[PDB]
């Protein structure tokens, strides 16, 4: 329905699928990266019924479906379910067809190469896209925030990346890829809500908990003080209404979950927290770099939207950092969806139109070509 | 750079006035239309309710 061959831009993560066209300032539509399948035997005849449901269809009919996410902490493994997600994203939402548009997809700098190769292969072989470009999420995160220099803190559902970039250059030795993410917070919250007498173990229950987290959770600037009062009084409790009419009242779990970002040991992770990884990624850089990176810690992705998160990390980084120098976190409202915006910025740059893999070079070389053409 | 800040104030103040007006007017239009409408719905329902109460009394006599 577009009147120009604008690139399509999409962030296909372990959580949400964000999509729109290059040149806009927001995805046109956002939905979960879900393909659902019936877990029951049908008994009525002439009921239609799909073998599998996609995106909002998967959630709408979820009462009898098991729901799977094709992307595992940033990498695509179930490419067949992702073909369905892309087809839905492009044709039933954006009303575009990749065949008529070049397409940009994105991944973290230390994301296994298999992800970039499979995304390239499917868009060229099943969607017949005229061109492809796998972008770096860190590049897109700083484009959207307006920086050439800073730390990308992309703390979303899949993985936290923690990468320093200076004057548009990577400083890769200082990347602290961390297995701590929004996806772990959903499962951790299911376990601490179990402690309160409300057990959650199934897909429907997981989707309920993901909704509780997204609507009730925060981290707070001072954890121990927030904990002491939440654990002592109903004044810091907040209720949540479940799809079936049940009501759950949540106290310190409201922040104890999110606090795992600063205290990863809560989920058994060997980590000092996201503020230390930010700190060390800067400390491993030269001193004429550090002055600019400490003043530009930049948030992207989910969990960055929690109350107290920018202040919590800035406080800890500042405490670890030397004096005189200023430490600051950049945390714009275009949060959680800013990498998509960065994709639009990259896709539309004149300096980027020579970076595309065309569907000529692709067939001559095969999908491994992405490893040499994109970055 | 400082022009960014000026542009921000220009859009925020153009928005402020658009908003003082939209905030108030969207409510006055929706809200006064809603009560006027539902003041009438409330009265019509009350009239019908009285009429049905009368109808029930008449049937009881029948």
């Amino acid at each position: 329905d577009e009147d120009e061959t604008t690139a399509l831009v999409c962030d296909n993560g372990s959580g949400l699928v964000k999509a729109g066209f290059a040149g806009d300032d927001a995805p046109r539509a956002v939905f979960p990266s879900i393909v659902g399948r019936p877990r029951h035997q049908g008994v009525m005849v002439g009921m239609g019924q799909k073998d599998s449901y996609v995106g909002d269809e998967a959630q709408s009919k979820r009462g009898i479906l098991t729901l799977k996410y094709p992307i595992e902490h940033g990498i695509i493994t179930n490419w067949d379910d992702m073909e369905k997600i892309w087809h839905h994203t492009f044709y039933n939402e954006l009303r575009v067809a990749p065949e008529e548009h070049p397409t940009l997809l994105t991944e973290a700098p230390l994301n296994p190469k298999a992800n970039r190769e499979k995304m390239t292969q499917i868009m060229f072989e099943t969607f017949n896209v005229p061109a492809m470009y796998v972008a770096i999420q860190a590049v897109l995160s700083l484009y959207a925030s307006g920086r050439t220099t800073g730390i990308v803190l992309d703390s979303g559902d899949g993985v936290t990346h923690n990468v320093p970039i200076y004057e548009g250059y990577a400083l890769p030795h200082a990347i602290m890829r961390l297995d701590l993410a929004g996806r772990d917070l959903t499962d951790y919250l299911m376990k601490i809500l179990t402690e309160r007498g409300y057990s959650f173990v199934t897909t429907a229950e997981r989707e309920i908990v993901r909704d509780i987290k997204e609507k009730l959770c925060y981290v707070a600037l001072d954890f121990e003080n927030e904990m002491a009062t939440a654990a002592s009084s109903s004044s810091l409790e907040k209720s949540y209404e479940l799809p079936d009419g049940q009501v759950i009242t949540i106290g310190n779990e409201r922040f104890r979950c999110p606090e795992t970002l600063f205290q990863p040991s809560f989920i058994g992770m060997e980590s000092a927290g996201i503020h230390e990884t930010t700190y060390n990624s800067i400390m491993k850089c030269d001193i004429d770099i550090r002055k600019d990176l400490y003043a530009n810690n930049v948030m992207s992705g989910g969990t960055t939207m929690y109350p107290g998160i920018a202040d919590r990390m800035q406080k800890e980084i500042t405490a670890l950092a030397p004096s005189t120098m200023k430490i600051k976190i950049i945390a714009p409202p275009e949060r959680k969806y800013s990498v998509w915006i960065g994709g639009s910025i990259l896709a539309s740059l004149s300096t980027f139109q020579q970076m595309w893999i065309t569907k000529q070079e692709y067939d001559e070389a095969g999908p491994s070509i992405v490893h040499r053409k994109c970055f | 750079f400082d022009d960014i800040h000026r542009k921000r104030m220009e859009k925020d103040l153009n928005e402020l006035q658009a908003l003082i007006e939209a905030h108030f007017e969207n409510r006055k239009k929706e809200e006064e239309e809603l009560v006027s409408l539902k003041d009438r719905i409330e009265r019509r329902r009350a009239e019908r309710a009285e009429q049905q109460r009368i109808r029930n009394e008449r049937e009881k006599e029948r």
């Binding site: 005189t324 200023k326 600051k328 714009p332 409202p333 | 800040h5 921000r8 925020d12 908003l19």
Partner: peptide, 29 residues
Amino acid sequence: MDAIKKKMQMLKLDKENALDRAEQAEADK
């Protein structure tokens, strides 16, 4: 409070920047 969410960002950023300027203006010596 949408008005606040943005005014909040505007003022925190503007005061932080103004403060950073106040501190540097003196600190530069």
